[PDB]
Design a protein around this ligand. Structure first.
Ligand SMILES: Nc1nc(=O)c2ncc(C(=O)O)nc2[nH]1
Length: 258
């Protein structure tokens, strides 16, 4: 009757504490009973009961502020958030999703649905910057938490709210989806660095649906046609088999098997 909550703080964050956080997120996103070619699948949206539909990620910072994100277990998407007495949700893509989000944060005094949706393309337009120009790392996360916290009081400008959602989505949902992206965030934390995601990260994020489909329709792991990804330097290279992606992709959106 209460969605599971996973907590993380940027205060004193370490490689280990962030690893533990991502590990716990993945364990609440899916039971891992459905696995294809060794890669776990998230639950199928079709028929999933509303009491199993979301998980909550509570984020706190050194500035002593806390916000709670809500993630959809079917796709790990961030659907909205709460900060004390206000909660905000991206505009839903359909009436069923609009109904499902009514079961989030039910006791909050003030609820709002943004005019805009939450996909990267729309967020980047609102932010005035692409993912490739938005730094990630503990420093960015601590600032995003504060920016989300102050939004209900009028203190946070919309382009900074959208930048702050882009940071959270990549450092939580994308890291859950891809060990490679989790590793990129671990490296930033290890060296107290803040830097934008390189093309390898961006193209993996953009490819998640396509890779979920290609792995799940594969012939014993062999892709039906090669998929082009980007190296760190922006060069394209082909992948032909799920085997090379085992240490890279952690979760997939559901597809029916062949
Ligand atoms: N809100 C949100 N949560 C996500 O996990 C997410 N992940 C991917 C994309 C995207 O490809 O455009 N947008 C997202 N937006």
């Amino acid at each position: 009757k209460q969605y599971p909550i996973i907590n993380f703080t940027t205060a004193g964050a370490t490689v280990q504490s962030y690893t533990n956080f991502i590990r716990a997120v993945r364990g609440r996103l899916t039971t891992g009973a459905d696995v294809r070619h060794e890669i776990p699948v998230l639950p199928n949206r079709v028929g999933l009961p509303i009491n199993q539909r979301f998980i909550l990620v509570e984020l706190s910072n050194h500035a002593e502020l806390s916000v709670t994100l809500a993630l959809d277990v079917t796709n790990a998407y961030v659907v909205g958030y709460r900060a004390g007495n206000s909660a905000y949700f991206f505009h839903p893509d359909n009436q069923e999703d609009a109904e499902a989000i009514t079961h989030l944060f039910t006791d909050v005094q003030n609820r709002y649905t943004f005019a805009f949706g939450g996909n990267y393309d729309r967020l980047e337009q609102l932010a005035g910057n692409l993912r490739e120009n938005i730094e990630l790392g503990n420093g960015p996360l601590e600032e995003a938490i504060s920016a989300l916290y102050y939004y209900s009081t009028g203190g946070t400008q919309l382009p900074t709210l959208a930048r702050s959602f882009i940071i959270c989505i990549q450092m939580i949902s994308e890291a859950a989806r891809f060990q490679y992206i989790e590793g990129e965030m671990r490296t930033r934390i290890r060296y107290n660095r803040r830097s934008a995601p390189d093309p390898s990260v961006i193209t993996l994020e953009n490819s998640w649906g396509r890779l979920s489909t290609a792995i799940q329709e594969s012939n014993q792991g062999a892709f039906a046609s090669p998929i082009q990804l980007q190296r760190r330097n922006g060069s394209k290279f082909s992948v032909y088999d799920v085997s090379i992606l085992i240490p890279i992709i952690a979760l997939m959106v559901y597809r029916c098997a062949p």
